[PDB]
Enzyme design. Structure first.
Site, short mmCIF file in Angstrom:
data_model
loop_
_atom_site.label_atom_id
_atom_site.label_comp_id
_atom_site.label_asym_id
_atom_site.label_seq_id
_atom_site.Cartn_x
_atom_site.Cartn_y
_atom_site.Cartn_z
CD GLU A 185 -27.27 -46.07 -10.39
OE1 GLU A 185 -26.73 -46.96 -11.07
OE2 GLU A 185 -27.69 -46.26 -9.22
CG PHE A 186 -31.90 -40.33 -10.03
CD1 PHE A 186 -32.54 -39.14 -10.37
CD2 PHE A 186 -31.50 -40.52 -8.72
CE1 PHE A 186 -32.79 -38.16 -9.42
CE2 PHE A 186 -31.74 -39.54 -7.76
CZ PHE A 186 -32.39 -38.37 -8.11
N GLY A 187 -29.40 -38.93 -12.08
CA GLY A 187 -29.38 -37.56 -12.55
C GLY A 187 -28.41 -36.74 -11.74
CE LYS A 221 -33.36 -34.24 -6.79
NZ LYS A 221 -33.92 -33.93 -5.43
CG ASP A 269 -33.30 -37.24 5.92
OD1 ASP A 269 -32.59 -37.48 6.92
OD2 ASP A 269 -32.87 -37.34 4.75
NE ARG A 294 -28.42 -36.30 6.15
CZ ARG A 294 -28.56 -36.55 7.44
NH1 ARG A 294 -27.77 -35.97 8.33
NH2 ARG A 294 -29.51 -37.39 7.85
CG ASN A 295 -31.69 -33.37 4.09
OD1 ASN A 295 -31.12 -33.53 3.01
ND2 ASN A 295 -32.04 -34.38 4.89
CG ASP A 348 -34.22 -34.63 1.31
OD1 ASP A 348 -34.72 -35.18 0.30
OD2 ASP A 348 -33.63 -35.26 2.21
C1 LIG Z 1 -33.22 -28.15 -7.98
C2 LIG Z 1 -33.88 -28.78 -6.93
C3 LIG Z 1 -34.81 -29.78 -7.21
C4 LIG Z 1 -35.49 -30.42 -6.17
C5 LIG Z 1 -35.24 -30.06 -4.85
C6 LIG Z 1 -34.32 -29.06 -4.56
CL1 LIG Z 1 -34.03 -28.62 -2.91
C7 LIG Z 1 -33.65 -28.43 -5.60
N1 LIG Z 1 -32.76 -27.46 -5.32
C8 LIG Z 1 -31.52 -27.81 -4.94
O1 LIG Z 1 -31.15 -28.98 -4.86
C9 LIG Z 1 -30.67 -26.81 -4.66
C10 LIG Z 1 -30.98 -25.50 -4.57
N2 LIG Z 1 -29.91 -24.72 -4.27
C11 LIG Z 1 -28.76 -25.38 -4.12
N3 LIG Z 1 -27.60 -24.76 -3.82
C12 LIG Z 1 -26.41 -25.38 -3.62
C13 LIG Z 1 -26.26 -26.69 -3.19
C14 LIG Z 1 -25.00 -27.26 -2.99
C15 LIG Z 1 -23.86 -26.50 -3.21
C16 LIG Z 1 -23.99 -25.19 -3.65
C17 LIG Z 1 -22.85 -24.42 -3.84
O2 LIG Z 1 -22.79 -23.57 -4.73
N4 LIG Z 1 -21.90 -24.66 -2.91
C18 LIG Z 1 -20.60 -23.98 -2.75
C19 LIG Z 1 -20.78 -22.68 -1.99
C20 LIG Z 1 -19.40 -22.20 -1.56
N5 LIG Z 1 -18.33 -22.83 -2.36
C21 LIG Z 1 -18.70 -22.78 -3.78
C22 LIG Z 1 -19.86 -23.71 -4.07
F1 LIG Z 1 -19.46 -24.91 -4.54
C23 LIG Z 1 -25.25 -24.63 -3.83
S1 LIG Z 1 -29.07 -27.00 -4.37
#
Ligand SMILES: Cc1cccc(Cl)c1NC(=O)c1cnc(Nc2cccc(C(=O)N[C@@H]3CCNC[C@H]3F)c2)s1
Length: 284
Positions: free
Chosen positions: A20-22, A38, A131, A135-136, A149
């Site tokens: 929702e927020f982003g 993010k 947490d 999933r994290n 996370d």
């Molecule tokens: C950006 C950011 C801000 C604050 C905290 C954090 Cl932990 C982050 N970084 C992230 O949320 C992420 C860093 N890397 C991430 N990689 C990610 C997450 C979810 C899905 C995918 C992704 O590409 N998934 C599949 C892999 C195989 N099928 C094709 C893709 F859709 C990649 S998310």
């Protein structure tokens, strides 16, 4: 403090996580290095800003192979952005469920050693995760697992698996469920669940048991059964993560040490714990 990045250096390409927020994007940081991005959309509250930039502040204080690396933030412009390394294989729980049976036992155990090394770092840095769950955890193209996370209230608030405090029951230690005692030792309980998730390729803990049934089963001494094809040493370790008495659980330093030793003498993983079957197939 942290690295302030100019918006002109950032190119959002794919939505890999929305809210929702982003949203969370895959992108590029200066069409050269891939990053995750993010965002925080306009109209955010003071609390949302503190929680959002507070996640970046926490991550910026960490420097470890098994903790998601912060590239920088965009705070001088809107929308605000947190930019991190891009983990190509996504969340560990979904990753394992989509690659069922495709890895060796030694590979699976190495994932757990990486997670444990990240958690040992966090615990020694006096950061309680609250947490910890597959999933994290995020996975890159080298199969390296990194804890993700971060934040304060924001972590449990934004996890849908956390139910109304507001916690993810199946991953949470009894003292944390009962009277909100979150410590590195309750993270250890959660790590035992993560061990079970990894060795089962993302099975749902306790399967269809309800949250109340899980708490009831735990309090009466029941624990998750052995996964299929699970090393005896690995099942013994996760069982000790699940000791009711918090002071009897291994510290993360102990977990990393044990996992190190098993990986370095990899024949020790060939001794499997007995698996009790749920189907009898008898053939003449
Ligand atoms: C950006 C950011 C801000 C604050 C905290 C954090 Cl932990 C982050 N970084 C992230 O949320 C992420 C860093 N890397 C991430 N990689 C990610 C997450 C979810 C899905 C995918 C992704 O590409 N998934 C599949 C892999 C195989 N099928 C094709 C893709 F859709 C990649 S998310």
């Amino acid at each position: 403090f942290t690295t302030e990045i100019h918006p002109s250096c950032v190119t959002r390409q794919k939505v890999i996580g929305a809210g929702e927020f982003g949203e969370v994007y895959k992108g590029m940081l200066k069409k050269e290095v891939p990053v995750a991005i993010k965002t925080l959309k306009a109209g955010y509250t003071e609390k949302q800003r503190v929680d959002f930039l507070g996640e970046a502040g926490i991550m910026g204080q960490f420097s470890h192979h098994n903790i998601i690396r912060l590239e920088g933030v965009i705070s001088k412009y809107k929308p605000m952005m947190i930019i991190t390394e891009y983990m190509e294989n996504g969340a560990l729980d979904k990753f394992l469920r989509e690659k069922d049976g495709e890895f060796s036992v030694l590979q699976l155990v190495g994932m757990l050693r990486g997670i444990a090394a990240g958690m040992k770092y966090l615990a020694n840095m006096n950061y309680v995760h609250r947490d910890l769950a597959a999933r994290n955890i995020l996975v890159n193209s080298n199969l390296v697992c990194k804890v993700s996370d971060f934040g304060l209230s924001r972590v449990l608030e934004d996890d849908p698996e956390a139910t109304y405090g507001k916690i993810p029951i199946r991953w949470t230690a009894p003292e944390a469920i009962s009277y909100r005692k979150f410590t590195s030792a309750s993270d250890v309980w959660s790590f035992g669940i993560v061990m079970w998730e990894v060795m089962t390729y993302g099975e749902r803990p306790y399967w269809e048991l309800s949250n109340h049934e899980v708490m009831k089963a735990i309090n009466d001494g029941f624990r998750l059964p052995t996964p299929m094809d699970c090393p005896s040493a690995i099942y013994q370790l996760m069982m000790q993560c699940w000791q009711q008495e918090r002071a009897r659980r291994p510290k993360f330093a102990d977990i990393v040490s044990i996992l190190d030793k098993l990986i370095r003498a990899p024949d020790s993983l060939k001794t499997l714990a007995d698996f009790d079957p749920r189907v009898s197939i008898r053939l003449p």
